[PDB]
Subunit: 428 residues, 3 copies
Amino acid sequence: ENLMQVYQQARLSNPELRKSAADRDAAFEKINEARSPLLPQLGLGADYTYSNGYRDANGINSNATSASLQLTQSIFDMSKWRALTLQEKAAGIQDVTYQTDQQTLILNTATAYFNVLNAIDVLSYTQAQKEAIYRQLDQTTQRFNVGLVAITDVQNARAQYDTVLANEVTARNNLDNAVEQLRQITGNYYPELAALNVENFKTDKPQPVNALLKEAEKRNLSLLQARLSQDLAREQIRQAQDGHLPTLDLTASTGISDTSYSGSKTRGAAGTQYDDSNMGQNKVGLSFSLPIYQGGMVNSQVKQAQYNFVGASEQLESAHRSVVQTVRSSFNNINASISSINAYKQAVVSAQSSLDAMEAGYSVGTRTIVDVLDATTTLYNAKQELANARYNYLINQLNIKSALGTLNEQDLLALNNALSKPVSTNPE
Amino acid sequence: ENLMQVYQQARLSNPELRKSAADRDAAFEKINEARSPLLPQLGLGADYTYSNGYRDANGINSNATSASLQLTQSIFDMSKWRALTLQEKAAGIQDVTYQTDQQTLILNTATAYFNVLNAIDVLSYTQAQKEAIYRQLDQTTQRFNVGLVAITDVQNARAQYDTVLANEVTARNNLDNAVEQLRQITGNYYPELAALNVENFKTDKPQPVNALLKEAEKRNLSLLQARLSQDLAREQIRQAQDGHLPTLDLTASTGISDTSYSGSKTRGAAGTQYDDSNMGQNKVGLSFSLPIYQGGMVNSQVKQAQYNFVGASEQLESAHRSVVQTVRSSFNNINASISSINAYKQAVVSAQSSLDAMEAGYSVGTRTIVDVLDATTTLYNAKQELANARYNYLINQLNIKSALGTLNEQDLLALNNALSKPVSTNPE
Amino acid sequence: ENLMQVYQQARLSNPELRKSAADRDAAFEKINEARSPLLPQLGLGADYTYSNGYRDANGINSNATSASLQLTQSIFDMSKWRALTLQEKAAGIQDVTYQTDQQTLILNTATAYFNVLNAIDVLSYTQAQKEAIYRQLDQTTQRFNVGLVAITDVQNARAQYDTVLANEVTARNNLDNAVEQLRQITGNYYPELAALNVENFKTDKPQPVNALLKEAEKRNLSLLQARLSQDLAREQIRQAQDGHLPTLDLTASTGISDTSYSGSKTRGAAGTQYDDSNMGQNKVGLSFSLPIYQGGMVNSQVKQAQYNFVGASEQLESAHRSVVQTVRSSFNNINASISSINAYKQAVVSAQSSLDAMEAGYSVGTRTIVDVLDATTTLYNAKQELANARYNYLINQLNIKSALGTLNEQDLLALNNALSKPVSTNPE
């Protein structure tokens, strides 16, 4: 298919992606965990309880049966507000981790897609080598049947033929592996894939890296997740700062308490005090609590999270020196791959002129049919490493746009505007 | 040694294995952690307490010395029953994580074993190259001492000889590293290792991939650990479903409580109320508690673990597409590596013909002794990449069986039925 | 720059190192977290409370306003003393994890330094190839303009020229990458770097491995972190052994308690019992608690940490066989790399003689100017793989010392006493 229908099946059915989409749904749901202790805590509680004295307290035994309804509320506790702000930012992280995994799918689909078109073409290469080096064997054998070569040059040329098998079988094996790199990323065995339109394919010079990198610092996802990790661990400071701050929570505990006596001291005058006490109480109010001095535990956690922030503030700079290396890598990979194509497109023009010197040289007779088929195979060796350079250009645009972070389904379209007529993956 | 005694020392003495075997013992012991809160909580407590009033409550001060024995019990709490069921499945995971690490030890021993026999033979290769390219040098020197060559053809031939030293030293160094890859996996320096019996070695065609992969899905361990990953996080939903369900526990708190007064209000009529009260109580009964509304914390944890299950459900489909690429990789490696052998088995028959064209060509005199020894080295270049292809076939059987999960000490024996006569590992 | 000023900017500005430097400051600060529950726990609490009876308990309602100051103290709990000892040893681990990252900086500075001087010289190589293979093109063209070659022999030679573009562009791309590998580790673009002084550089024979590995076991940082990992998990046993031990903690809870009635049963005789009870209490004493039987939770955690220790004792043996492999690897890498040098230094002496056979051959006229420049590029091929062997010798000294753990700024000086005169990183 065209690469979009390869990607649009891959977008809906990537298990590497739908896992992260679930964790992006998990982290956004994890905010509702964090905002929930700010919401009330209504819980029912019931008790049966039989006290049993065995001393001076013997004879006073009671079936104190009490049921109660508790409600507590985070009136003022800035840690839960911070843990809300922690969890939003960690969800802001985990949205970016998803935003990587869109582009990671977009990249690795086209990577696995063009590795099929590589291996489709290597299959077209090596069967044109097996039409050649078997033809080399099928005449070095037919020289030995006459007497032109020694038995080495047969048993050599068979070994040069059987190496063609141990390359062409691997070509047929790297075909199915590349298909199963692609089923791994999309979901299905794909019969035909869209080959590259050489007519609508241009060697565009990319944008200058000083404009790329400042665009990368607004968008790139290793950097952006490292920004928000710094934004995460800065609030981890202020969480530990909220152990200094007091904890004011609300008390609301309502419920019955039936307290019925038993035992030997129940036998008595009972003094208008010893009756089957059937009571009920509703305690409303507030619970204030301030940690004054926890042995500097809170100050330790503040001092911990400060170095943990400096530990995280290096992970910005760890990534912020890494994006500069990564952006300049792909920009200096594509500038390689532009000159790589303008080599291997010239290397086609060699092996196209060298082939057509043979076809004219065989039509008049000076070169033989096996110097044709070797030069045919010399042509397809150009046209792999042409196409492989044509794919690694089209990959390294995506390696730019992913390292820019601007990678989407629009840069994918600029690939798929160049993929016009299909070629199959079926070993003939 | 034969591969079994290499493995049987490795099976008993692999720190990569025994750490997992300790963790397989640590995971099954962790089940007894899970079943332990279902068992009682018998704990003895004791208190000394001097109340000190300083207000209207001054004068009522007491050395309240109380010692109490406590017992509680998980009467009804489905989360602990779930945590029992989680931990059995999570140790059901970690049993499979061990079951990988048996086969990982089976494979990586055979990987490190056959990398010795490779590196032994490269050592036998490169000294048959150093017997060759030295005689290449040691005649260009004698051509220069006469005058047949320029000083370039000596200092080239010294450089082509010194490259052979820069390979035969690495062959000796990759020998000792291969021994130390083997000592890393087994435990000892091994003096002689069993070379491959070429007579009882066959190029068997493997079972078809439609039979392999359906046998893989019943057995394969990355998949099986991912199935039980799904089975673990499915119950993590039902753990979070047990925040809905109430918590019924038992109360058994029994013990003395001596209350002996002090202060100014102790001086008085005492009302037959103010004595050194020496008491003791046994509270039996049940503790019921139902979380009604925790701010949707419980529902969020359900909704967390639902999407966390989908992430685990995608990690099955991650691995269930990753088993297919892994199984077809090995099945398309071994189909290559058969043809790789029949390539380099012919490359021996080429080079053994080319060698015997020299030994007959030197015994009559047409080719010289260095054109022999170059073609001798051409023979041993075939007999690496023969034997290396003989090992990579025998490795990729284990890359099948480990990616099938059927790898055991029986597929090991099919390797070791082919390793018959020993060869040393000492550079002569 | 010389390598020290490259390192001394890298020492002060490595975002990988300063991250671990903060984590080294984190774990040492985390000790003060561990010693803090041994320190007192002073916390202020305050309550407002309105009881609301609705039964036989109706009419008794009160504004029980109580404020309380609490202080608790770890009198006797050996787990906190163990968790102090756990944290110090985990800080003993994390100090070693820093000590790796000193050397990991020292190595990867020198590695990324010597990969610039690799790529500088490949840039000096490949322009001498483009000063050669362009002259190969620029006279096959002038053979064709007269008629000595076919159009295949030009369009091949153009393709051999355009491959030299597709290397020399990558040489300039790998130049900027190596500069940005260096900016990634130090912090800046560096204009000139000190090339290797070949005169004061020697091919020293290293220390024997029987002394190295015993000096490694006293010093090496993977192994030392694994020892302290074992030293960590042994105390993890003695933590869970301190669940057996009792928990004696101090009670110091002091504070007011103002209890002012309200309701219908407040109206009454009041019995010198029902007043605005404005009270206050100070509870001093101790809290003793002994877990007798937690369902075998404590024994299981002992039995967990025992098998977890054996896993850690295998992680010693995991690393302790790994260091034996690692130390012998670098020692057998540098023994390779010395013989690599005396290969590629001889390969200079060939390609110096083969060049000087051209300069004496072109000055008299037998060989042409392109056979000069092709043999010049033959020289600069030797001078990469000499210099690369001159760099891999100097790296594999540090791969010894980092896998010894004796790597510091003194072995770095033995590098930098060989880096004398600067060469630049600017493609001319």
